[PDB]
Amino acid sequence: RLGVCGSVWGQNDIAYRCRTCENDPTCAICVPCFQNGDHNSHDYSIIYTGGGCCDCGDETAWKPDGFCSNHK
Amino acid sequence: RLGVCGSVWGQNDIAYRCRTCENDPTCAICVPCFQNGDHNSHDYSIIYTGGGCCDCGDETAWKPDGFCSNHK
Ligand SMILES: [Zn+2]
Ligand SMILES: [Zn+2]
Ligand SMILES: [Zn+2]
Ligand SMILES: [Zn+2]
Ligand SMILES: [Zn+2]
Ligand SMILES: [Zn+2]
């Protein structure tokens, strides 16, 4: 559609790591952002976050081709 | 052929609005997707996007009959 997520996790909340899309190993995206992007052949995993915030839409934390349809 | 576009616009990049195909007035498709679909008697216009991403292939933003040959 015509035009950062920043959703927040608590201690035991799950999220996705995607090693193909991350800027570095501390980056992560929320489950909705993961589900609305394309990671089909990517090396992704469900993680327990220990808290933090979603990197989707932030080119300094996540590769743009890994953004979801709502944060491009 | 056998089986979302998500191409991204910058601020001053053009795209197409199709009022016949859009799910709402904030939806748009890129020029290649417009040219590879059928909008013959549709109420379409070239627009300056102000940024965003192409909705072609996403049934939640665009009517499937409006998808191009590459996103069906
Ligand atoms: Zn998110
Ligand atoms: Zn997102
Ligand atoms: Zn990925
Ligand atoms: Zn497109
Ligand atoms: Zn298309
Ligand atoms: Zn149309």
Q: Give the three-class secondary structure for A35.
A: helix
Q: Token pair of B20, please? A: 């016949």
User: Which residue of B lies nearest to A36 if distances are taken between CA atoms?
Assistant: B4
B41 min Cα distance to partner chain A (Å): 22
With beta carbons less than 8 A apart as the criterion, state whether B5 and B59 touch. Answer: no
Let me know: does A63 contact A19? Beta carbons within 8 Å.
Answer: no
User: How many Å separate Cα A14 from the centre of its chain?
Assistant: 11
Q: Where are the beta strands (DSSP E) in chain A?
A: 8-9, 14-18, 44-48, 52-53
A70 in reach of chain B (CB within 8 A)? no
Q: Which two tokens stand for residue A17?
A: 């790591």
Interface check for A64 against chain B (CB to CB < 8 A): the answer is yes
Query: Is residue B43 within 8 Å of B21, Cβ to Cβ?
Result: no
Q: How far is CA B36 from CA B33, B51, B54, B67, B71, in A?
A: 5, 21, 13, 8, 10
Helix (H, G, I), strand (E, B) or coil at A10: coil
- Is A72 close to B26, i.e. CB distance below 8 A? no
Q: What residues contact residue B16 under an 8 Å CB cut-off, 6+ apart?
A: B28, B29, B30, B31, B34, B39, B44, B45, B46, B47
Neighbours of A49 (CB within 10 A): 19
Q: How was this structure determined?
A: X-ray
Task: Give the gap in angstroms from C-alpha A72 to the nearest C-alpha of chain B.
Answer: 6
Give the DSSP per-residue string, B12-71: T-EEEEETTTBSSTT--B-HHHHHTS--TTS-EEEEE-SSEE--TT-TTTB-GGG--TT-
